[PDB]
Write a protein that binds this ligand. Sequence first.
Ligand SMILES: *C(=O)C(CNCCN)CNCCN
Length: 8
Amino acid sequence: XCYXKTCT
Ligand SMILES: *C(=O)C(CNCCN)CNCCN
């Protein structure tokens, strides 16, 4: 998930 550039 890139939800806040978190790109997990
Ligand atoms: C979120 O985008 C992640 C994939 N990592 C980013 C680059 N491939 C997939 N979903 C989160 C992990 N379960």
